[PDB]
């Protein structure tokens, strides 16, 4: 329950920060939310900022993903479909990671630099998969860089889709496999 308390505080951390973002959340509240003293949470994670990063360390993507290409006999479409589903599902399960990360990103906050490392491996697996598919002639795009940009931009911002209107994985796949007439 030392371990349980810690998880409770982290679980709380994710919940509160998500509702109000970094500025607006207080340790008091997270303490309160996990049902422990302020003191305990400030001791275990030494302050707000560290507790903030620990939430990304704990709930982010950093060691969650296997090697999808390998796992899929190097069929790139299957590899991407599985990568995107696991990426979007991991966020759907911990949505603050995406909401908070996207905020820090569009605001280019000072926190961004120490948050990014919890995303970097997932972007670079995306790149490898896209490049293998391009190599095999199954994906077609003009720039790997542009493509990685629009894919991660919409995957990390699920709510923008509904706002825009009122299926994502297959739309990303259909976009990539479409071969231009030319």
């Amino acid at each position: 329950s030392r371990e349980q308390t810690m998880e409770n505080i982290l679980k709380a951390a994710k919940k509160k920060f998500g509702e109000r973002g970094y500025e607006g959340t207080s340790i008091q509240e997270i303490a309160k939310e996990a049902k422990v003293n302020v003191a305990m949470a400030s001791y275990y994670f030494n302050g707000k900022e560290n507790l903030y990063y620990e939430v990304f360390k704990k709930y982010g993507l950093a060691n969650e993903l296997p090697n999808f290409l390998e796992k899929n006999q190097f069929n790139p479409i299957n590899a991407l479909r599985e990568y995107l589903t696991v990426f979007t599902t991991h966020i759907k399960e911990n949505p603050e990671i995406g909401t908070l990360a996207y905020e820090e990103i569009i605001k280019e906050s000072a926190r961004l630099e120490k948050i990014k490392p919890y995303f970097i491996g997932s972007f670079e697996q995306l790149k490898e998969i896209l490049q293998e598919g391009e190599k095999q002639g199954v994906f077609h795009f003009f720039s790997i860089n542009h493509t990685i940009h629009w894919i991660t931009s919409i995957v990390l911002f699920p709510k923008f889709k509904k706002f825009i209107d009122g299926g994502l994985v297959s739309r990303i796949i259909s976009a990539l496999t479409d071969k231009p007439n030319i």
Copy 2:
């Protein structure tokens, strides 16, 4: 310069709302920033909520670009995206405030949604024209509108993810599948 005064209030509201969000700003901070008393602000805008919306009206977002560009969807799109981009770069609070409203899904969203609505029906017409002239190639118009508006409306994302070619240029090359020139 009663317009200049109103402007000052709008400028101050954008700035102050930008920094703390709708909840964490008040007419006092805004009024102070604009160097008028609250009564002046209340006079012209009557309340934080309405001020908020006036900011979007004042700073959100238009000519018909296919027409302005002789029914050429490439140039029409390049101009449209270039104007969209410049604007968001000068008015970054719009993006961040929109982000928060979309994320939080407040009543306020539906009122401010309108100040993007128009932009995106035009984007759509340009894309569809370019498809039929065979210069743009994409599987889904709606999926294309989606990732385009997503990356144009939050251009800082680009810099995080690129951690070396222009946003507008990259979008055009993605659709034409050709070097942008």
